[PDB]
C-alpha cells in the first residue's frame, strides 16, 4: 500500500470554517467548555 499523505493548507481549511457542516454543536462537551457560558 503506497502511502500518500492527505495535506491541507491553512487557507483552504479556514475557508471551510463557515460551512454549514462546520456549525454542528459538539455532543460530548462539558458545559464549562462551551463558548459564552
Amino acid at each position: 500500500p503506497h502511502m500518500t499523505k492527505l495535506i491541507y493548507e491553512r487557507a483552504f481549511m479556514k475557508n471551510l470554517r463557515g460551512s454549514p457542516l462546520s456549525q454542528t454543536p459538539p455532543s460530548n462537551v462539558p458545559s464549562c467548555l462551551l463558548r459564552g457560558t
Binding site: L6, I7, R10, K14, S22, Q23, P26, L33
Partner: protein, 162 residues
C-alpha cells in the same frame, strides 16, 4: 452538495483543569474540527491554570507514556499576549497539525497550550527526540508558519530532561 473533508489522522481534544487529563472529543474531518472549535471556549477564555491539548488518536498529553517518553517538544513562550493573538496562534498550530503541514508530520504527537496568567506556553510534541531531520524541519516550519520572533524563545527540549 457540501461533503466533509477527511483528515489524514484522527485527533482528540483534551482539557486539563490544572492521570488528570480529560478526554473531550475526537474528530476526523475539517468540518468536525470547526464544529468543535467554533463551539468551545478559546484559550483566551478558559480557566487560568488549565491546558488544552490536541493529540493524534492513541496518544495522550502525558510525557511518560510509551508514545512520548523518548520524544521532545518545541516550546513557544507567549509573554502577556493579547487575547486575539493568543487564540490565533493556537488555532494556527492546530491547523498545522491537522493539515499535516510538516514534511515529517508523522513525527508529530500533538500540541499543548498552557494558560498561565502573565505568560502562556504552546508546545508541539514529537515522538523521537533524537530524530534530527524531523525535529529541525518541524521547528523551522513552526517559526515560519507562526511568524515567531525572538521573544517567543522557540526552543527544543527532550521530555526526559524536564
Amino acid at each position: 452538495p457540501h461533503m466533509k473533508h477527511p483528515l489524514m489522522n484522527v485527533w482528540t481534544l483534551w482539557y486539563l483543569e490544572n492521570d488528570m487529563q480529560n478526554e473531550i472529543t475526537s474528530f476526523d474531518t475539517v468540518e468536525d474540527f470547526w464544529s468543535l472549535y467554533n463551539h468551545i471556549k478559546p484559550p483566551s477564555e478558559i480557566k487560568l491554570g488549565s491546558d488544552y491539548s490536541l493529540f493524534k488518536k492513541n496518544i495522550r498529553p502525558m510525557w511518560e507514556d510509551a508514545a512520548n517518553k523518548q520524544g521532545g517538544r518545541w516550546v513557544i513562550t507567549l509573554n502577556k499576549s493579547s487575547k486575539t493573538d493568543l487564540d490565533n496562534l493556537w488555532l494556527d498550530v492546530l491547523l498545522c497539525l491537522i493539515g499535516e503541514a510538516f514534511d515529517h508530520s508523522d513525527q508529530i504527537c500533538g500540541a499543548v497550550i498552557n494558560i498561565r496568567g502573565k505568560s502562556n506556553k504552546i508546545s508541539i510534541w514529537t515522538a523521537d527526540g533524537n530524530n534530527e531531520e524531523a525535529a529541525l524541519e518541524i521547528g523551522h516550519k513552526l517559526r515560519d508558519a507562526l511568524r515567531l520572533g525572538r521573544n517567543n524563545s522557540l526552543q527544543y527540549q527532550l521530555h526526559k530532561d524536564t
